């Protein structure tokens with residue numbers, strides 16, 4: 001079911017492009033980029049509703065271990081389904097429309113070994129237990145991922161400029177300009 005094949009260094013890729021694994025998550029926290037009012041664990045509603053993600057830790061902080069205002073807070077990633085998935089842990093989505101998600105939170109290694117246990121940032125050939133160099137946990141509090149019918153799809157991933165509405169949202173996060 002995984003369509004991204006490991007390269008000579010173990011990193012799963014699809015027609016050269018790097019792949020990522022995905023999951024859904026819900027937890028109601030403000031999150032590691034400070035996207036809510038300062039000092040309170042209350043996310044702005046948009047950060048529960050939009051296409052936002054908690055990437056695995058080493059991408060979140062560009063190789064570091066900071067779980068507050070990681071270096072990649074506010075970046076956006078375009079995720080494109082390959083049609084693949086990890087057997088027993090996902091399925092094939094109905095279409096392969098790409099979706100852009102903004103980084104507003106972190107998936108720490110601690111307590112997320114299977115998917116987020118990756119010991120180096122992309123570029124360094126470290127992978128999770130399924131062979132991907134990065135993992136994106138996708139916020140699903142209001143069913144925004146369920147609505148895509150994404151059941152942990154395998155994707156190719158790249159950083160892209162954020163759409164204007166997400167850039168404006170990110171400007172009220174506390175980690176904007178740290």
Ligand SMILES: OC[C@H]1O[C@@H](O[C@H]2[C@H](O)[C@@H](O)[C@H](O)O[C@@H]2CO)[C@H](O)[C@@H](O)[C@@H]1O
Pocket residue numbers: 027029030031032033041054067068105106107108
């Ligand atoms: O919620 C504010 C709080 O977020 C912390 O990041 C957590 C996040 O809350 C949780 O949803 C996610 O799954 O894990 C990360 C990392 O544990 C952040 O680390 C705190 O500094 C921040 O105050």
